[PDB]
Amino acid sequence: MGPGFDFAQAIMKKNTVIARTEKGEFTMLGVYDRVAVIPTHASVGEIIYINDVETRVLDACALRDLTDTNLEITIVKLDRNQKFRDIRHFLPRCEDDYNDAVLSVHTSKFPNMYIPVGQVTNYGFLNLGGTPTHRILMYNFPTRAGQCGGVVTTTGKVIGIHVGGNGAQGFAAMLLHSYFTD
Numbered sequence: 001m002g003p004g005f006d007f008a009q010a011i012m013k014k015n016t017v018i019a020r021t022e023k024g025e026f027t028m029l030g031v032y033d034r035v036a037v038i039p040t041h042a043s044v045g046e047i048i049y050i051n052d053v054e055t056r057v058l059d060a061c062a063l064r065d066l067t068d069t070n071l072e073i074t075i076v077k078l079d080r081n082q083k084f085r086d087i088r089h090f091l092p093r094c095e096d097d098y099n100d101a102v103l104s105v106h107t108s109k110f111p112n113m114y115i116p117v118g119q120v121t122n123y124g125f126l127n128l129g130g131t132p133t134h135r136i137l138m139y140n141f142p143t144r145a146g147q148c149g150g151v152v153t154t155t156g157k158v159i160g161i162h163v164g165g166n167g168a169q170g171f172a173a174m175l176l177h178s179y180f181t182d
């Protein structure tokens with residue numbers, strides 16, 4: 001409808017796949033080469049389904065901060081025959097607050113879904129499903145089951161992936177440029 005949705009759509013059309021684990025279907029953001037991200041509660045194993053194709057997982061790392069606190073991001077390298085467009089230059093370098101964000105989801109349950117979530121707070125600590133979690137972004141939208149892995153964007157930046165909600169608020173794990181240096 002506007003330049004926020006334009007950026008979100010450009011990311012969804014080229015840099016997302018549908019990932020299926022034993023714990024469900026997730027929006028999965030491809031970042032560069034064969035490297036993608038997913039919420040850690042997806043419990044990625046040795047084999048994952050990518051757009052309904054059986055795919056070997058070459059590496060999977062559940063990120064934690066230097067206090068050994070959960071960040072709820074898993075970085076996955078996929079044995080896929082094709083690379084993602086490199087979008088690392090759209091990742092923020094530091095923890096921050098944002099105005100006017102969009103949460104975008106693409107699954108079998110929720111195809112081509114875009115949600116203007118508004119202001120995003122650097123919330124920090126969250127007890128997420130009983131697990132102490134850091135670097136959480138918060139938005140005042142009643143997000144539902146099926147939106148985990150959804151991409152949070154502003155104009156020109158990919159800032160997070162949806163990892164939970166409490167019925168009135170939604171929570172995303174920050175994406176930082178330093179997670180994807182090589």
Ligand SMILES: Nc1ccc(-c2ncno2)cc1
Nearest residue numbers: 110113115142143144145147
């Ligand atoms: N986060 C939400 C909110 C509402 C819906 C919906 N309502 C009817 N059909 O879909 C879906 C996702």
